[PDB]
Amino acid sequence: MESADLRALAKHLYDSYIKSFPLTKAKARAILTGKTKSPFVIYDMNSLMMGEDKIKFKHITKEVAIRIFQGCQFRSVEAVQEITEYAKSIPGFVNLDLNDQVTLLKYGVHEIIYTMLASLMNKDGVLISEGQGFMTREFLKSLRKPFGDFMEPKFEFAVKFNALELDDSDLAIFIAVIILSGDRPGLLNVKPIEDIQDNLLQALELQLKLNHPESSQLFAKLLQKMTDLRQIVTEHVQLLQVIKKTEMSLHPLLQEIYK
Amino acid sequence: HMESADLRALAKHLYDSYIKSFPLTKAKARAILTGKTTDKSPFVIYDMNSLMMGEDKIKSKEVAIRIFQGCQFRSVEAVQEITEYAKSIPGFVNLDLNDQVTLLKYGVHEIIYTMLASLMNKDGVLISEGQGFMTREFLKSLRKPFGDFMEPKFEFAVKFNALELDDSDLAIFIAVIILSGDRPGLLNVKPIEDIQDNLLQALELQLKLNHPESSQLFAKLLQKMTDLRQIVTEHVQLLQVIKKTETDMSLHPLLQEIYKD
Ligand SMILES: CCOC(=O)c1cccc(COc2cc(C(=O)O)ccc2-c2nn(C(=O)c3c(Cl)cccc3C(F)(F)F)c3ccc(Cl)cc23)c1
Numbered sequence: 360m361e362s363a364d365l366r367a368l369a370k371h372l373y374d375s376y377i378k379s380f381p382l383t384k385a386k387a388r389a390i391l392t393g394k395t396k397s398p399f400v401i402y403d404m405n406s407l408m409m410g411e412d413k414i415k416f417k418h419i420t421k422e423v424a425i426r427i428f429q430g431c432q433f434r435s436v437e438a439v440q441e442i443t444e445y446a447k448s449i450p451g452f453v454n455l456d457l458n459d460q461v462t463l464l465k466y467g468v469h470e471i472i473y474t475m476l477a478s479l480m481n482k483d484g485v486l487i488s489e490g491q492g493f494m495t496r497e498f499l500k501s502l503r504k505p506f507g508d509f510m511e512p513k514f515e516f517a518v519k520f521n522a523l524e525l526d527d528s529d530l531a532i533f534i535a536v537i538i539l540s541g542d543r544p545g546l547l548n549v550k551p552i553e554d555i556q557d558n559l560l561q562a563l564e565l566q567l568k569l570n571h572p573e574s575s576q577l578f579a580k581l582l583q584k585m586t587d588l589r590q591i592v593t594e595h596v597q598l599l600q601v602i603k604k605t606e607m608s609l610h611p612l613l614q615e616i617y618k
Numbered sequence: 619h620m621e622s623a624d625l626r627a628l629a630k631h632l633y634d635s636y637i638k639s640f641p642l643t644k645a646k647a648r649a650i651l652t653g654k655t656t657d658k659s660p661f662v663i664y665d666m667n668s669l670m671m672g673e674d675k676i677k678s679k680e681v682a683i684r685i686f687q688g689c690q691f692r693s694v695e696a697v698q699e700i701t702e703y704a705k706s707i708p709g710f711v712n713l714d715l716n717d718q719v720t721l722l723k724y725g726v727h728e729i730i731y732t733m734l735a736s737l738m739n740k741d742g743v744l745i746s747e748g749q750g751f752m753t754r755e756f757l758k759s760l761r762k763p764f765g766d767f768m769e770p771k772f773e774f775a776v777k778f779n780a781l782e783l784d785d786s787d788l789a790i791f792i793a794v795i796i797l798s799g800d801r802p803g804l805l806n807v808k809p810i811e812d813i814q815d816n817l818l819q820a821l822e823l824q825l826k827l828n829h830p831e832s833s834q835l836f837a838k839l840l841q842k843m844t845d846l847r848q849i850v851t852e853h854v855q856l857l858q859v860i861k862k863t864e865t866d867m868s869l870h871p872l873l874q875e876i877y878k879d
């Protein structure tokens with residue numbers, strides 16, 4: 360592809376990405392750094408109870424660790440729809456076989472949710488409620504039984520990923536590359552998916568050299584993270600399934616929403 | 619950063635050392651596998667009877683155990699060849715000695731898988747310096763847990779070999795794997811990353827020059843490189859589970875130490 364076509368693709372994806380996701384990394388970073396109403400901070404039990412009285416979350420119907428976990432699930436379901444809408448803007452995606460569209464999204468959303476959650480995180484906590492809240496890492500890590508160990512790996516990944524210092528225009532292409540993975544199980548027509556991903560990879564490569572000219576082999580470093588995400592996600596799903604098997608107790612309708 | 623001439627010089631150095639370090643190259647393996655030559659033809663082992671004839675021609679335990687000891691013996695040799703290759707990588711021996719060990723400990727299995735693919739096609743694997751060829755089917759039909767222990771090596775190889783890398787490409791790729799700064803327990807990550815950045819630069823240019831019509835081959839090769847991470851952990855887990863049931867299995871101390879934590 361010609362460079363002009365690659366920059367057109369990068370800007371097209373950036374524009375759609377800004378429209379698709381409520382809180383961008385740039386805005387999140389402004390909140391986390393203090394360069395912008397202070398968000399309400401949840402740092403222990405009492406501040407959690409006050410936060411759900413002030414913020415009034417949508418997942419509120421239980422134990423504290425459960426309530427937080429269910430807040431995470433509720434937001435992930437929201438993210439899945441935001442990512443699904445974003446995919447439609449990826450040139451060529453909507454022309455793929457409908458089953459392959461479903462397959463790509465089915466196996467991709469988890470890696471993208473992990474990736475984009477890093478935009479909302481620093482080493483000390485995570486932005487919530489479209490940035491109105493900030494729940495500290497220590498409080499999330501100290502949750503009982505497997506919940507503490509379920510939260511901390513997200514921060515562990517985010518701290519390393521954020522050292523790459525990607526911005527939103529970088530992430531918009533990177534997220535598209537993840538979606539267009541030709542090795543997802545059960546794909547019917549791999550060829551056009553790789554054809555698009557090859558185009559996205561060229562655009563990402565050019566974007567990173569222009570946007571980060573002093574960042575050596577950042578392209579290579581980002582690709583390694585992308586396939587790290589594979590196993591991080593499979594570990595996530597294992598814990599996620601063990602959590603439901605050991606704790607759930609949900610209305611079956613709720614189970615289907617979260618299935 | 620490095621200038622192109624320096625990057626090509628690094629590529630040629632690595633290829634020279636690789637040829638000096640690894641006795642059976644992919645180029646020779648493919649010459650044997652492709653055939654159309656009378657002098658290099660392997661004896662093919664495809665069942666019990668041919669295994670007995672092969673062990674007489676090629677030169678008292680269960681069959682699956684005997685094959686396993688053949689694999690580990692050769693993996694131990696591979697560790698030795700990989701260790702010798704690493705020392706030739708500019709900067710490696712200058713690193714903290716603990717980090718040298720750590721890099722080798724976590725790197726050799728990913729490299730063995732990579733280089734085992736050179737010896738494989740979809741129907742089997744070259745053995746005994748290419749004098750033999752054992753079919754995939756025969757390996758897959760081994761009893762107990764051994765049959766399923768063998769097949770994933772072929773599964774990786776068929777996909778990896780689709781990239782059509784040659785030895786000069788592989789020499790650099792193998793070097794990139796060794797110089798991974800994210801191995802657990804490394805003491806000084808920064809100088810390892812500095813070397814890897816030079817190796818990644820060299821790999822990128824090598825793949826563009828050697829495979830100009832291969833779209834984003836650099837990116838595809840990097841994706842394989844981090845798949846090997848889990849492919850290896852599945853191997854190691856299986857090997858530990860197998861070892862608990864099979865007493866007739868003894869691991870070489872070199873391998874035993876590699877798998878400890
Ligand atoms: C007072 C009540 O507190 C809260 O409501 C609360 C508490 C802490 C954090 C959050 C917000 O969380 C997220 C936001 C976003 C976003 O805004 O883009 C994306 C992801 C998460 C998030 N998912 N998750 C998962 O486990 C997960 C993931 Cl990664 C992928 C797929 C499915 C799931 C899940 F199983 F959950 F379904 C997290 C684990 C830890 C943390 Cl810290 C955040 C997340 C809200």
Ligand SMILES: CCOC(=O)c1cccc(COc2cc(C(=O)O)ccc2-c2nn(C(=O)c3c(Cl)cccc3C(F)(F)F)c3ccc(Cl)cc23)c1
Nearest residue numbers: 684685688689690692693696730731734743745752768771
């Ligand atoms: C009757 C006589 O038969 C034989 O002598 C015999 C039979 C079959 C295959 C082989 C050759 O095998 C290898 C050769 C090389 C090489 O030449 O570079 C590298 C690797 C292998 C090889 N390791 N392996 C492992 O399991 C393994 C691995 Cl990957 C890494 C570390 C430790 C081990 C192990 F546990 F073994 F300790 C294989 C599994 C399947 C296959 Cl197909 C090949 C290999 C020789």
